[PDB]
Amino acid sequence: ASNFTQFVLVDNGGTGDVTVAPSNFANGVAEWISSNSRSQAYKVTCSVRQSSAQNRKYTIKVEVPKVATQTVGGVELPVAAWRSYLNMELTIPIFATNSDCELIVKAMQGLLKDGNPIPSAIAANSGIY
Amino acid sequence: ASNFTQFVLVDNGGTGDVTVAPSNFANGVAEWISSNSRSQAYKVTCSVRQSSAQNRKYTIKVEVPKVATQTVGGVELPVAAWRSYLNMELTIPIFATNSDCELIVKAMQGLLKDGNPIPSAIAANSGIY
Amino acid sequence: ASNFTQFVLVDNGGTGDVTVAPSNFANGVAEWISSNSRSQAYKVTCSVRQSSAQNRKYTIKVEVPKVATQTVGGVELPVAAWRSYLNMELTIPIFATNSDCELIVKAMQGLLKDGNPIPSAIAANSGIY
Amino acid sequence: ASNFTQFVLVDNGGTGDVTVAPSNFANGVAEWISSNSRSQAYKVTCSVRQSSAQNRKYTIKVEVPKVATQTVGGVELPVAAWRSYLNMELTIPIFATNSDCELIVKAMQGLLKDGNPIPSAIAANSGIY
Amino acid sequence: ASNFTQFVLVDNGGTGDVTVAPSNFANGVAEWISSNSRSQAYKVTCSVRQSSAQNRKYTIKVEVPKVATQTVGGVELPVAAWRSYLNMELTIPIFATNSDCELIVKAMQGLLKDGNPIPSAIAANSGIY
Amino acid sequence: ASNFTQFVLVDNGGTGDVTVAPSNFANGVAEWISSNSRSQAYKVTCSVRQSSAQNRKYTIKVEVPKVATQTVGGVELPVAAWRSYLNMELTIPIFATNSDCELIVKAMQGLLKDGNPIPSAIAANSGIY
RNA sequence: AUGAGGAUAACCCA
RNA sequence: AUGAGGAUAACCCA
RNA sequence: UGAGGAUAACCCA
RNA sequence: UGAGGAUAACCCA
């Protein structure tokens, strides 16, 4: 085992599929990036900390880039027009068993499942109403 | 097009699923809760706002109860020992189109798909290794 | 030659053994935990470093849960009442060869072999007499 | 009974076996040393203390010497080229029964058993990877 | 996945090979060490950092020891008569794609390939001429 | 005899090969340059000096350019969008024989051989993990 | 009391 | 530690 | 930044 | 000396 493996971040049925691979673990922060210039890459980082006497806190971040080709000084450089950032912090009490944690993961998956409220609003550039 | 409807948060294949229903809309902050006491309920809240001139920001929060050894409807203290808190912040540049936004949602779904690094780590009380 | 693998920490002759598996590697500090909630798990961590010009130092830590009258997966406070902590520091002069080091390991195994003074004292809630 | 007895610290199948014998109990610190000049001897000490209202703390130390013969002032003296030090502190809650303590001893024995991760790294002058 | 693994630093057929194995990864600095006495061991360290807005910078170091035995007072220790120190820094703009990095690596391997100017000058205790 | 000759810096089969040729040897600094526009050329420099009573020190440098065309005012020049900079310093005690230097060179070639930790991290825009 | 603080080791440091 | 605080993103603010 | 030194993740201009 | 920066045989502590 070793869970520090590559995985598909964006799935488009095996074509134009954004896959992300391990790329750094310096300072206890696991990092994953896509095969791109460090300036246009998708980035995912994760770290766990004993935030308190009875808490553990996962801090996960994702960076989704809008790739573009700029012309600085009359030369073409691969760059990102802009980036979208996901910042999630998950605090779990040390008393949570494995089955308790599986419950947290399922909640997070159901929360974002296609057709459910939240992902629908985000995808349509609107709020909940 | 009302998207503020109930949905399945925790899916256990029809039997033992956890449905979360609309429960509050004070201050534009939509809220959904399961059918439990508020100390033992699954809670989901979501709001959007113009964080700045350049970005919009979705703030999603989830609360998941510790179920192992739980006493349904009882008084369980300290509260911090029986609850996990998820806190998501999605920043999206105002230039993102409905398409760009669908891609961002896909990125979030991929991050948490079964068998992938992050969810596998969480479900096993582990970090990355 | 990867040595960061799972192993049997508590051996009860095949039946009721406690296996500890890799669970974190943040900051070069390897971690192993049993399949329990982190409040009731067996935890083992180990790191090495150059403590000084002349020595290297292994820092090994073990956490063992109090099992008698335990409620699997429950909330048990105060935490200090339900856990024992082992803290080992092994200082080895940089001149030690693989051989010198095998002897040191043998010394540690001998110290804790069954029937010997130290382990017998610990297992009976006693001191030396 | 009396657990203050001699024992084999380093075992090489009854030949070149480093045996250690009781040698001092002054100030509540039990001491054991091998049959050697006090300058080249293996040393083991142990002491138990009521470190807190609800804790007991064992403090065990082992000194493994690299024996040599120096020539100070043109004369030969038995000495130690260097020493390796083991420093372990074990904190046990007063609520731990005898069967709970037996669990701690077994964990410590399994931790150092031949072939397991930690003793392998130490013996090969490497880290965990 | 993991690239923080053991590897052959000096290749002498199959036998005489110098292998270096992971030992420490503290504060973003990976470190490999060869087996046996730390004092006569080969050392390799590596680290990456965002040296500026547009640059990432690798800092690699190698230490080749001249194995020898020091005798003083008739006491002998395994030491290194002296050490040779390699010290490189590689700067790469964030605009570099994986393809560009593969070129940079080939450039380094070419620089040191057998028979070329530089590796030959070094191997003969010479400079350019 | 002469080692200040032309050589293949980047090997791409037989075609696509980047060759560097002598260009200048002023003030103890040897310099190689690839053909065509100096502006988009690969550069390598080398020099040795008695850094101290016991040490000689080599200073090698490599520059990998990112070939591109700059257009300004409709006037276009062959330029380098950016450059990657290798920079190494090798210190070798005067006591090193030719055999020791051959080892030092093998150590460097091993460090950068295909598939090993470091050359792989660099080629993938990654660090250690 | 805590330190993946140090040691020349029943001592010393924060 | 808390923020439906900000960000140019393992940082900054109250 | 250094064809700046080193006892090497330190130090100097 | 620097896991100090660089536009790279220069520059900073």
Coordinates of N, CA and C in Angstrom, one line a residue, chain A residues 55-98:
Chain A
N55 N -9.0 16.7 18.3 CA -9.4 16.9 16.9 C -8.3 16.7 16.0
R56 N -8.7 16.3 14.8 CA -7.7 16.1 13.7 C -8.4 17.0 12.6
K57 N -7.5 17.7 11.8 CA -8.0 18.5 10.8 C -7.4 18.3 9.5
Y58 N -8.1 18.0 8.5 CA -7.6 17.8 7.1 C -7.8 19.1 6.4
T59 N -6.8 19.5 5.7 CA -6.9 20.8 4.9 C -6.5 20.4 3.5
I60 N -7.5 20.5 2.6 CA -7.4 20.1 1.2 C -7.7 21.4 0.3
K61 N -6.9 21.5 -0.7 CA -7.0 22.6 -1.7 C -6.9 22.2 -3.1
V62 N -7.7 22.7 -4.0 CA -7.6 22.4 -5.4 C -7.6 23.7 -6.1
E63 N -6.8 23.7 -7.2 CA -6.7 24.9 -8.1 C -7.0 24.5 -9.5
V64 N -8.1 25.1 -10.0 CA -8.5 24.8 -11.4 C -8.2 26.0 -12.2
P65 N -7.3 25.8 -13.2 CA -6.8 26.9 -14.0 C -7.5 27.0 -15.4
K66 N -7.6 28.3 -15.9 CA -8.2 28.5 -17.2 C -7.0 28.8 -18.0
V67 N -6.5 27.8 -18.8 CA -5.3 27.9 -19.6 C -5.4 28.9 -20.8
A68 N -4.3 29.7 -20.9 CA -4.2 30.6 -22.0 C -2.7 30.8 -22.4
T69 N -2.5 31.5 -23.5 CA -1.2 31.8 -24.1 C -1.0 33.3 -24.2
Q70 N -0.2 33.8 -23.2 CA 0.0 35.3 -23.2 C 1.2 35.7 -24.0
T71 N 1.3 37.0 -24.3 CA 2.4 37.6 -25.1 C 3.1 38.7 -24.3
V72 N 4.0 38.4 -23.4 CA 4.7 39.4 -22.6 C 6.0 39.7 -23.4
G73 N 6.3 40.9 -23.6 CA 7.5 41.3 -24.3 C 7.6 40.7 -25.8
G74 N 6.4 40.6 -26.4 CA 6.4 40.1 -27.8 C 6.7 38.6 -27.9
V75 N 6.7 37.9 -26.8 CA 7.0 36.5 -26.7 C 5.9 35.7 -26.1
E76 N 5.6 34.5 -26.6 CA 4.5 33.6 -26.1 C 4.9 32.7 -24.9
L77 N 4.1 32.9 -23.8 CA 4.4 32.1 -22.6 C 3.1 31.4 -22.2
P78 N 3.2 30.1 -21.8 CA 2.0 29.4 -21.4 C 1.6 29.9 -20.0
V79 N 0.4 30.3 -19.8 CA 0.0 30.9 -18.6 C -1.5 30.5 -18.2
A80 N -2.0 31.1 -17.1 CA -3.3 30.9 -16.7 C -4.1 32.2 -16.6
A81 N -5.2 32.3 -17.4 CA -6.0 33.6 -17.5 C -6.4 33.9 -16.1
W82 N -6.9 32.8 -15.4 CA -7.3 32.9 -14.0 C -7.4 31.5 -13.4
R83 N -7.6 31.5 -12.1 CA -7.7 30.2 -11.3 C -8.8 30.2 -10.4
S84 N -9.4 29.0 -10.2 CA -10.5 28.9 -9.3 C -10.0 28.1 -8.2
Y85 N -10.3 28.5 -6.9 CA -9.8 27.8 -5.8 C -10.8 27.1 -4.8
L86 N -10.5 25.9 -4.5 CA -11.4 25.2 -3.6 C -10.6 25.0 -2.3
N87 N -11.2 25.4 -1.2 CA -10.5 25.4 0.1 C -11.4 24.6 1.1
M88 N -11.1 23.4 1.4 CA -11.9 22.7 2.4 C -11.1 22.2 3.6
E89 N -11.8 22.5 4.8 CA -11.2 22.1 6.1 C -12.2 21.1 6.7
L90 N -11.7 20.0 7.1 CA -12.5 19.0 7.8 C -12.0 18.6 9.1
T91 N -12.8 18.9 10.2 CA -12.4 18.7 11.5 C -13.1 17.4 12.0
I92 N -12.4 16.4 12.4 CA -12.9 15.1 12.9 C -12.5 14.8 14.3
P93 N -13.4 14.5 15.2 CA -13.0 14.2 16.6 C -12.3 12.9 16.6
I94 N -11.3 12.8 17.5 CA -10.5 11.6 17.6 C -11.3 10.3 18.0
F95 N -12.5 10.5 18.4 CA -13.4 9.4 18.8 C -14.1 8.8 17.7
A96 N -13.9 9.3 16.5 CA -14.6 8.8 15.3 C -14.0 7.5 14.8
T97 N -14.7 6.4 14.7 CA -14.3 5.1 14.3 C -14.2 5.2 12.7
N98 N -13.7 4.1 12.1 CA -13.6 4.0 10.7 C -14.9 4.1 10.0

